[model samples]
Target: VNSFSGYLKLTDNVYIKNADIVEEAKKVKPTVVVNAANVYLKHGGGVAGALNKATNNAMQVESDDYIATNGPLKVGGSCVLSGHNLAKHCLHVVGPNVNKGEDIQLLKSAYENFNQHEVLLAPLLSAGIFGADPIHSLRVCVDTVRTNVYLAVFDKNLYDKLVSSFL
Candidate 1:
């Protein structure tokens, strides 16, 4: 319903915008797109699935290569791949699986660990199937970010949830 090139605040400088990752990756062409990767770095469902489809398995190929080269990634760890389409790079980060008895520290570390680029296109990491509570996770995202982020929020359901608390 609303579209603008300008960013609106969701917290301190969070560019809370009604855009999906792939859409804004093309539109803004950020320097790095953050992926909510699994520990094994498989391009499976949720955010990784979307990224895999968008980049045409670039994430999968590079993920395979990374694990093949460096073993499985642990929680709070990251690997980078060559970006396809408009973005120049992809930084794959393994977030904690809350359902697997994981906690927020690892997730907090995951957020803070990925550093600055021109613009980081990101979504609500671990809040979907990985099962981190949405409100708390968004707080972590807001609290931990030191880089510029254009938040990808497609669904108004989630958007409203964030806005009620964040804005």
Candidate 2:
């Protein structure tokens, strides 16, 4: 458990801390929260689902329109959506479907194209329903720009372990 009032580093310059997405948004909100979306930018499940719910459908509506005009987002490519009611901005990236295989290549490409921000919170790309190890994604996260970067973990057990290690 953490005794500090701020984020805790897990490893690879990534931080793990406990705070509900919406609640945290109210205090010291991030500049942008990256969303792992399909080429269509649909926020049907995983972190994107939560982002959609938190932002009050703003993300979904914006993404839907972008997809209709731009067609499917290419792998390793990304698009931005409105972060109104959530944050300043939302970066939408087309992540690989991990079910097919462990393709860090696509994830690496996506991260490479990311727009840098002072404070950014992102999920473990291709993890969760997409089926990839969150830890492995952390490696890629740090390889990118190393500033204020955080990874959200829903399980307290995982969060505890991560924080305790650093303590």
Candidate 3:
């Protein structure tokens, strides 16, 4: 699964994978794992919930403290979670629940804000509970990714859409 050629290559370094992000992150054991989040950084559902649960709710506690000090994470804003499960850290990004093309830039911002990692492990941003179109997000993510990223895509439909675009 770590093999680049084993998955759909979205760009020179961005690879699309149909995998459970939590499991993939553990195998990759990256310094940080990227997750979709609410403005409050609440690991309430979707990728957020799973990662938080896997980490024994450490992510939620940290998120609570961050929000208490920093207020809500604005759409396109991101913050770090020090929960040492799934991965050594978690980069929770707030993405817009948008369907219009005009909001794609914000979605792109969500993906690009945290690319300092070498082998980026990220779920399909804005494609889950946030409701952005998966194929649309895949294109936008590919457009902005600046480093090697292994996008952990879970949904069968979304995976197909991204692969279709890549093929």
Candidate 4:
């Protein structure tokens, strides 16, 4: 990593860092944290699983309840759940799946539609499980949101690249 303070200010409000997202989320304690979800609102793996492990599956249970009433959540659509272990609230969205030929537009839509509250923290949506390019997804995220967004990254190389871009 480019050794700074474990944080990088990508923009006025946007920040990135090389660290465990969950641990970083704990430090900042933003108003809300976005969790990648599936159509069924299953917080089975990825960041969702990490969160579920910490919160005792609170997000999963909440998501399931929301699905029960609202039906299956659409690709760009999301549902908010009470933050069980981290932030005060959790925004859940299904990221684009590159393996399934999911387009980048869907990922953009997710960010565009994610205009709920301020002081948000999120991961590289669609970059992991969906196999989308992390940098591209990051661009979409930065372009879509009007407010400052906090991003957590585990890869040092990626983190350095992101910081370099900002510079």
Best by lDDT: 3
- Most accurate candidate by TM-score: 1
Rank list by lDDT: 3, 1, 4, 2
lDDT of 1 by residue, 1-167 (tens): 12337556775456776667777777766778888888888887887888788878877887788788889987887777777884788888877888888876888888875555545778777778788877777788888886667677767688778877773
TM-score of 3: 0.88
Residue pair clashes in candidate 2:
none
Q: Runs in model 2 with CA error above 4 Å?
A: 1-5, 10-13, 100-102, 160-167
lDDT of each: 0.76, 0.69, 0.77, 0.76
Tell me the lDDT of candidate 3. 0.77
Q: Which pairs of residues collide in candidate 3?
A: none
User: Per-residue lDDT for 39-126 in model 2, tens only?
Assistant: 7787888878887888778778888888788789887788767777766777777767878664667877777655456567666677
- Per-candidate TM equals 0.89, 0.81, 0.88, 0.88
Give the C-alpha miss distance for residue 116 in model 1, angstroms: 3.9
**Candidate 1, backbone clash total:** 0
Higher-ranked by TM-score: 1 or 3: 1
Q: Could you tally the backbone clashes for each prediction?
A: 0, 0, 0, 0
**Candidate 4 Cα lDDT to native:** 0.76
Give lDDT tens digits, candidate 4, residues 72-109. Answer: 98887777888776888888878877888877789888
Model 2 misses residue 45 by how many Å?
1.2
